[PDB]
Design a protein around this ligand. Structure first.
Ligand code: NDP
Ligand code: NDP
Lengths: 325, 325
């Protein structure tokens, strides 16, 4: 028996229950991980709310974590008991003392990386990697727009953008979050709790606007992003914090001067035990070289996962926050 | 006084009237063209139907044509009376004996190109140019999907794709249109009057699907295009023959494996008297080199523009068709 956070029905935070459950016996290519640190991600709230249906109820939650390998399937050779690993993709269940998942979703941690750093970087870091390196290969000097610049993904994006020589214009909801973003490497900040983002962008870019706009909040900033992208530019809708963007008429893309739009998912970029490896190597290489940093991690006891999600959804957090089993 | 085709109200073909009107005096940078050949384009039916509002009623129609310069604005130096020109962008009014437009929308014709070739190539040719060279730089060997392969744009696309060494899979509504497309350079054809396009595409591409899908029919093929694009591939929605594609939830882009979508417009790519020049030079260079050809042009008297539009909308045409003033 082991403890985990699960829900028997979709809904608000009250739906989460900290209870005993019986971990499954690893498949031939599965790995049993004894979690030491668990990630907190906005998508966790969507599975719990039902925005994204689970395969069955009661359901586990979470897809990011780091810990020690406890058991290995008979066909697994990459990992052995005792190995220190991390993951940011795979089946639900990270919110547990013991998580079982395909070896394809795991990446061995270098002795130099702690479990807290991994649980705070993995998923969000892999996302920034594909957003800035694959979805749209940001080049030095480019002026890009990135919403929620002080959030989990946003904070890493500020740092990565700076590392690339790009000039990231990060939108935030308060002068406090603005200072946070700026300190992490944001070129310019815009407080969209009252400022006109599109206007500010037009002036900051000398009327040329941004070749690419990264939007993880969705609904509330869709028009803003459409008005901030340069002609034939790209609007990357990778999040739905404020809600999903729907009911769009492709005709608006033409109206905004023939722009492009994509709705990427980590699963599509890290769709191999291996495209994951290459991506993870770059992420951890950034950390090891000192271009990315975490130090400054809020910690909640796995049993208090509900409290942690409430703060996240309430927009009362900055950077990464982890759960300790 | 001169004759033109105009409409005092939006609606069906019956709305078109062949009447006398008084051409305006060219502005300082405007050019008066004595049309010898006028293009027929699907968008013409949309302005007439009201899908795209005119600035005022009664309104002229058409944006493609070729003829002799009759008058020049005082500030115009690129053109002089007698010059043989062509245009595929600009204000409404091509459906006339005399059309007045900014010099920025004109391109001098080489003595070797007749007015019929220009009126049949200009707009559609410039579109294929930006679709295959700018929207998505098709490379030799790539397998691409292109709907309505026997249409005006489609027919040129079959030829251009072949010239590029690409393998175009063209969808058509009949074995007759299929033969037409094939003869023009289409690699493979699919009769979507009954065949499963997505299925055929999956088998023709060995399960890899198409890096890019060009869709000028819209509504009726949106899902088909989404199911025919490769992961992280691009779906180019440049037309609405079957109707516009609306009410889409960006979430479907993720569902189809993180794809991209754009809704380009000729105006956005040929947005300069000059980006037009470079594009036109390539188009006419293809014609001059024998890679693109027209010969096989249906002709309607400008006064019978309604009959011409009825056939176009009825899907009873192949290649280009022009109106003679
Ligand atoms: N596509 C993919 O592969 C992935 C997508 N994501 C998505 O990326 C985004 C960022 O996730 P993560 O780093 O975990 O989260 P964050 O830590 O960034 O938290 C969300 C932040 O978004 C902003 N926000 C704007 N409007 C709202 C709103 N109405 N309610 C709540 N928050 C709002 C807030 O910042 P402020 O107060 O400054 O506005 C808030 O702090 C999410 O939308 C997430 O679902 C995450 C991982 C992968
Ligand atoms: N974005 C841009 O810059 C431009 C866009 N366009 C658009 O490109 C497309 C092609 O235009 P053009 O070459 O003039 O036209 P076409 O000559 O290709 O005529 C339209 C063709 O589309 C297909 N089609 C499919 N469904 C329908 C339907 N329900 N009703 C009528 N036709 C249908 C038909 O071929 P089949 O019978 O084989 O299915 C038909 O022949 C149009 O949608 C047009 O508006 C044109 C120029 C520029």
């Amino acid at each position: 028996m082991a403890k985990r956070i699960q829900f028997s029905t979709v809904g608000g935070p009250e739906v989460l229950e900290y209870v005993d459950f019986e971990p499954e016996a690893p498949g031939p290519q599965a790995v049993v991980v004894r979690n030491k640190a668990i990630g907190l991600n906005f998508i966790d709230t969507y599975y719990r709310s039902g925005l994204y249906p689970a395969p069955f109820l009661p359901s586990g939650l979470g897809a990011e974590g780091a810990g020690v390998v406890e058991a290995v399937g008979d066909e697994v050779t990459r990992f052995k008991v005792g190995d220190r690993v991390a993951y940011g993709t795979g089946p639900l269940g990270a919110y547990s003392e013991v998580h079982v998942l395909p070896e394809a979703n795991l990446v061995k941690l270098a002795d130099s990386v702690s479990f807290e750093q991994a649980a705070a970087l993995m998923l969000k870091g892999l996302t920034v990697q594909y957003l800035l390196r694959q979805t749209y290969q940001v080049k030095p000097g480019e002026i890009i727009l990135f919403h929620a610049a002080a959030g989990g993904v946003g904070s890493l994006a500020c740092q990565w953008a700076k590392a690339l020589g790009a000039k990231l214009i990060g939108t935030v909801s308060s002068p406090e979050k603005a200072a946070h973003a700026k300190a992490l490497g944001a070129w310019e900040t815009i407080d969209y709790s009252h400022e006109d983002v599109a206007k500010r962008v037009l002036e900051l870019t000398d009327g040329k606007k941004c070749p690419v706009v990264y939007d993880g909040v969705g609904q509330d900033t869709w028009l803003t992003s459409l008005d901030s992208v340069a002609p034939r530019g790209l609007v990357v809708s990778f999040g739905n914090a404020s809600g999903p963007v729907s009911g769009v008429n492709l005709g608006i893309l033409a109206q905004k001067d023939s722009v492009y739009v994509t709705r990427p998912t980590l699963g599509s970029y890290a769709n191999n035990a291996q495209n994951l490896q290459t991506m993870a190597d770059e992420l951890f290489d950034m950390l090891a070289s000192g271009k990315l940093k975490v130090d400054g991690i809020e910690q909640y006891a796995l049993k208090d996962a509900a409290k942690a999600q409430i703060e996240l959804s309430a927009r009362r957090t900055t950077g990464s926050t982890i759960l300790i089993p």
